Nucleic acid binder design. Structure first.
Length: 685
DNA sequence: TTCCGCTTGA
């Protein structure tokens, strides 16, 4: 008697809250969800097995009623939870305040079925004021929120389990499609096709080593040719992806024979500065690590895949070193802000800390389930003590901890305010007015850069955030002697493939996926054979091409990049009480007036889509990846057959034509690396 | 066969 049962999701927070509430409360953890739809037919209860909609696990013929069963892993969890329910007087459902957390609370309600008072609450900070205010001010279970979550789960089931069989019939069995993984696959595939249709273009100019004597004699820097007789010399940005000069007849593309000619055209010219401006910049510090940015920076700076970053992060959180690592917020508490303030003032002095309270709040709804990943506690464990506490076969724990520490303290520092030079020289070579340009820049005060520097992407490349290129000053009209002129030839480059970091940043930017499943999408798309990793680059497979093509050509809307965003727009309306749970579900599955013109509801419903497309999809066409024509104009295809992928071409044979010529490809040749020359070598032997 | 999402030890 007098005891209270408090259920939260994570055992760590369960132990903390138990410590700060003491006797008369027994705090336990549900470990996330405890029930779900049946994964496969085996998970369907027997007297529901011959139900026509059992393969879906959703009664779609009667207001989309889900068949919820207890997850076999969480069975013991619920056994103890039910038993423990018997010696308390009240039950505090204290899952997190988000949509899935409310749904979990409702599932606990349905599974425990308590006869005692229940109170719904959400604990933010683990302190006596916050916990007291959370317990003394309970609220009701948000059935609109639970309904929105149910709509999300049901849509993802109908999508995955109705579209995937189409893939089994048209492409190959055991293959999968889904709202998130199919769009990730389509992102990678689309970038690869961009790489296949890319045609590089060549363009020259001149690079110059210059000195500074006659200017203000207070010594070797570089410059590049920029304009010829009032006409800019072409650079990589001036060509489209087909090598065509981009919509501009006001640019001249130099070649070797010309660049050398001007290089020797006038070596004795005194270069005369023409125009010069000064540009100071004030760049604000980086927000603290959330799941996405921590995975990206741990990938680019420490070479950790998303999965490993999450393993190490899990150990660091469960052992008390860092805050919860599955989050989508960059806000901090006053305690963390002041902690990073004191550490920054300590290691970098009082002149390198932020003058104004740097708070990095986002824009979504206020109901922040979690906050940014930070070193846990009122005081930050020093990275040296962490260094000696973590040693053995896993120093990576300390490495990622050092990352999170340095980023977090960097978040509450003053801005960096360097300065860049815009140096424009002019002259004449031959008889033509030539314009040279150059840009260097130095950091006056590194600020937060003294603690944290973001790492440029590996395949994308670019200038570092703290990069500095120094050079002497100059005045308008000052003279400059040409030390050396050397011609330089460049070519345009195809767009870069995605790394795990850039893929994750992409998905996040589209508002798809979540902090808990980012690494899971990558694992999934690799496991289904859609994506394989070459170095750090994500390379799509041929059957990824076939699947992706089927999806955009017959289930287009379902793989639109903003599908997820429109869905979220609908579910927000469900959660606000503006729309009913099965209103848009009925519209989406069976058809009707609803949403954008391209919506599945307008197109007649997902059911009608799968029904007519399961009969009228050319499997040959879906499994024939159009590449290019040969030199005789005969098309060349990558056909994905039961024995793997083979390169096919229709040939003129003995008694005329047509006859297939085939040559199957080892998976070691990426799609873009297969040119026509490669294709006819493979066709040869 | 197949989904997304929440969370840890199977």
């Amino acid at each position: 008697s007098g005891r209270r049962l408090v259920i939260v999701e994570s055992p760590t927070k369960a132990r903390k809250l138990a410590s700060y509430l003491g006797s008369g409360y027994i705090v336990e953890s549900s470990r996330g969800h405890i029930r779900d739809l049946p994964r496969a037919a085996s998970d369907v209860p027997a007297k529901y097995k011959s139900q026509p909609w059992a393969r879906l696990g959703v009664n779609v013929d009667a207001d989309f009623e889900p068949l919820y069963i207890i997850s076999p892993e969480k069975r013991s969890t619920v056994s103890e939870l039910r038993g423990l329910l018997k010696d308390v007087d009240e039950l505090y459902l204290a899952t997190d305040g988000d949509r899935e957390g409310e749904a979990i609370a409702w599932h606990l309600l349905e599974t425990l079925k308590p006869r005692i008072p229940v109170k719904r609450m959400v604990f933010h900070e683990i302190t006596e004021p916050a916990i007291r205010a959370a317990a003394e001010h309970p609220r009701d279970l948000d059935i609109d929120l639970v309904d929105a979550q149910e709509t999300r789960r049901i849509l993802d089931r109908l999508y995955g389990y109705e579209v995937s069989p189409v893939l089994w019939k048209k492409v190959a069995p055991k293959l999968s499609a889904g709202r998130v993984q199919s769009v990730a696959t389509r992102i990678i595939v689309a970038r690869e096709r961009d790489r296949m249709a890319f045609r590089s273009a060549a363009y020259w100019d001149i690079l110059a080593k210059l000195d500074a004597s006659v200017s203000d004699p207070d010594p070797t820097f570089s410059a590049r040719l920029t304009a010829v007789a009032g006409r800019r010399v072409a650079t990589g940005r001036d060509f489209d992806s087909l090598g065509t000069l981009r919509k501009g007849d006001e640019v001249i593309v130099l070649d070797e024979g010309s660049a050398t000619a001007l290089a020797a055209g006038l070596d004795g010219t005194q270069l005369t500065v023409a125009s010069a401006e000064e540009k100071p910049y004030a760049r604000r510090p980086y927000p603290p690590f959330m799941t996405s940015t921590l995975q990206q920076e741990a990938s680019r700076k420490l070479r950790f895949s998303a999965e490993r970053t999450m393993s190490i992060a899990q150990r660091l959180y469960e052992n008390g070193y860092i805050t919860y690592m599955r989050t989508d917020s960059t806000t901090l508490s006053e305690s963390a802000i002041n902690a990073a303030r004191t550490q920054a003032r300590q290691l970098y002095g009082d002149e390198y800390v932020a003058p104004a309270p740097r708070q990095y709040t986002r824009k979504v709804k206020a109901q922040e389930a979690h906050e940014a990943i930070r070193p846990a506690g009122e005081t930050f464990a020093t990275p040296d003590a962490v260094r000696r506490e973590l040693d053995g076969p896993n120093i990576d724990d300390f490495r990622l901890y050092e990352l999170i520490w340095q980023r977090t303290v960097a978040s509450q520092m003053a801005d960096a305010r360097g300065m860049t030079l815009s140096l424009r020289i002019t002259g004449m070579s031959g008889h033509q007015e030539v314009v040279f340009s150059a840009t260097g820049r130095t950091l006056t005060f590194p600020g937060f850069l003294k603690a944290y520097v973001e790492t440029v992407d590996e395949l994308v490349g670019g200038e570092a955030d703290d990069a500095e290129r120094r050079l002497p000053h100059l005045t308008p009209g000052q003279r400059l002697d040409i030390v050396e002129l050397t011609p330089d030839g460049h070519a345009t480059n195809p767009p870069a493939r995605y790394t795990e970091a850039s893929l994750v940043k992409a998905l996040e930017e589209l508002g798809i996926g979540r902090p808990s499943t980012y690494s899971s999408i990558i694992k999934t798309i690799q496991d289904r054979g859609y994506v394989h990793k070459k170095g750090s680059a994500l390379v799509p497979s041929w059957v990824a091409f076939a699947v992706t093509g089927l999806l955009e050509q017959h289930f287009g809307r379902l793989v639109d990049y903003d599908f997820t965003a429109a869905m979220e727009d609908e579910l927000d309306e469900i959660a606000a009480g503006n729309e009913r749970r099965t209103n848009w579900l009925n519209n989406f599955y069976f058809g009707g007036d609803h949403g954008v013109p391209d919506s599945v509801a307008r197109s007649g419903g997902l059911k009608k889509l799968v029904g007519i497309n399961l009969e009228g999809i050319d499997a040959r066409e879906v499994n024939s990846i159009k590449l290019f024509d040969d030199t005789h104009g005969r098309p060349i295809y990558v056909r994905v057959g039961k024995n793997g992928p083979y390169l096919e071409r229709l040939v003129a044979g003995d008694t005329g034509e047509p006859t297939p010529q085939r040559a199957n490809l080892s998976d070691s040749i990426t799609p873009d690396e297969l040119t026509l020359q490669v294709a006819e070598e493979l066709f040869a032997t």
